[PDB]
Amino acid sequence: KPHISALNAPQLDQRYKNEFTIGAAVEPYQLQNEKDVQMLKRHFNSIVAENVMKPISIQPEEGKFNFEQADRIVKFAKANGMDIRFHTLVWHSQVPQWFFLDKEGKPMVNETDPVKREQNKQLLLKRLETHIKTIVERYKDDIKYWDVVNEVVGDDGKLRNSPWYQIAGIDYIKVAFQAARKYGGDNIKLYMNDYNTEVEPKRTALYNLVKQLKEEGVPIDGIGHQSHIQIGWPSEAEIEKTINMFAALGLDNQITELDVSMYGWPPRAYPTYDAIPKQKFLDQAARYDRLFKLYEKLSDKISNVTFWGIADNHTWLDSRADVYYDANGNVVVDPNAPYAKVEKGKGKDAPFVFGPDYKVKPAYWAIIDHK
Ligand SMILES: O[C@@H]1[C@@H](O)[C@H](O[C@@H]2CO[C@@H](O[C@@H]3CO[C@@H](O)[C@H](O)[C@H]3O)[C@H](O)[C@H]2O)OC[C@H]1O
Ligand SMILES: O[C@@H]1[C@@H](O)[C@H](O[C@@H]2CO[C@@H](O)[C@H](O)[C@H]2O)OC[C@H]1O
Ligand SMILES: [Cl-]
Ligand SMILES: [Cl-]
Ligand SMILES: [Zn+2]
Ligand SMILES: [Zn+2]
Ligand SMILES: [Zn+2]
Ligand SMILES: [Zn+2]
Ligand SMILES: [Zn+2]
Ligand SMILES: [Zn+2]
């Protein structure tokens, strides 16, 4: 199948229009690039902000709200008939430090006095409610899907002990969903988003957390599976079990940040796109073929599949693409091979079905067909 321009190619969202929406994460400057705009209009019917809707982007200082960048994404979505996902109301990264400072300016996590810790908990929860209220009151009529909390379960199977949890305990999760439903109403859909949702003990810990929260009447509508995955892991059988188990609790499932890395973990990356062997793209295409056949099998349980980017010229995985060099200066991509030094974050990954020149890859043909 030819490496044709993705602007002359069959629309990816139309191939999946009865199964689930097809989305992309974007930055506002991509809306000023003719190729990226052309790609969003041609192939996607859902959009999400890669970064400008995170807590530190929206309220960098208490009371100073920047909706300008977020507004540009929302206006583009509306003009183009796209669904919008909000990422994300609560997270322990890209979150402003002012949330966690007491009235005298000291970090609340340092407080030992029980009465003062309880006062700090209430102050943090009030600030959390106001952040959520201001955002949902502005976008409740435009944005259907919301990542209310992101990454609240740890990889060890315990709740993540971030400042949110250290200061307020489980109530910050409850307050966040409660607040989004209160100001957004019943028509917005609320999600708990996380990575490695297919991996134990995290998977069981998330399951138990959401089961309990719903038993308590906390309003959660679905689970976002970030799906930052590799060519061989996690297995499709494990992805299927995961999606099925959350659907059995009555939860919608969205694949929210899909990218299929060319590497393992920790990744040993090629230094440029040019150096990635052709065989890697065929291995990736076979993975995409099996993944999307599985998503179609489970389409009644998945409302959206969103890629964490548009095309291979821009992906956050490049920040993880470390390049290892041997004593002679040769690149090393075998995890067990000798190496002398590493250049962190300087290599290139190639995770999508669209190449860096906006031409389709073998993975695109693998998912646009009906085999
Ligand atoms: O310097 C800052 C950068 O580090 C920052 O990079 C962004 C980090 O978040 C990325 O998105 C996350 C990927 O991991 C998932 O688990 C999360 O849910 C996603 O939000 C994003 O792709 C990177 O651009 O960018 C902002 C700089 O200030
Ligand atoms: O900050 C988070 C990263 O730590 C996370 O990376 C994962 C770490 O565990 C590995 O098994 C996974 O391969 C890798 O993706 O990604 C999400 C990000 O928010
Ligand atoms: Cl990025
Ligand atoms: Cl190419
Ligand atoms: Zn379309
Ligand atoms: Zn090139
Ligand atoms: Zn569906
Ligand atoms: Zn980016
Ligand atoms: Zn090319
Ligand atoms: Zn196929």
From Swiss-Prot:
Key word Secreted present: yes
Protein induction: By xylose.
Presence of the UniProt keyword Metal-binding in the record: no
Residues annotated as domain GH10: 6-370
Pathway the protein contributes to: Glycan degradation; xylan degradation
Active site, UniProt feature: 151, 257
PROSITE patterns named in the record: GH10_1 (PS00591), GH10_2 (PS51760)
Keyword list, A-Z: Carbohydrate metabolism, Glycosidase, Hydrolase, Polysaccharide degradation, Secreted, Signal, Xylan degradation
Pfam families: Glyco_hydro_10
Similarity annotation: Belongs to the glycosyl hydrolase 10 (cellulase F) family.
PANTHER family: ENDO-1,4-BETA-XYLANASE A (PTHR31490:SF90), GLYCOSYL HYDROLASE (PTHR31490)
Name of protein: Endo-1,4-beta-xylanase
Organism of derivation: Geobacillus stearothermophilus
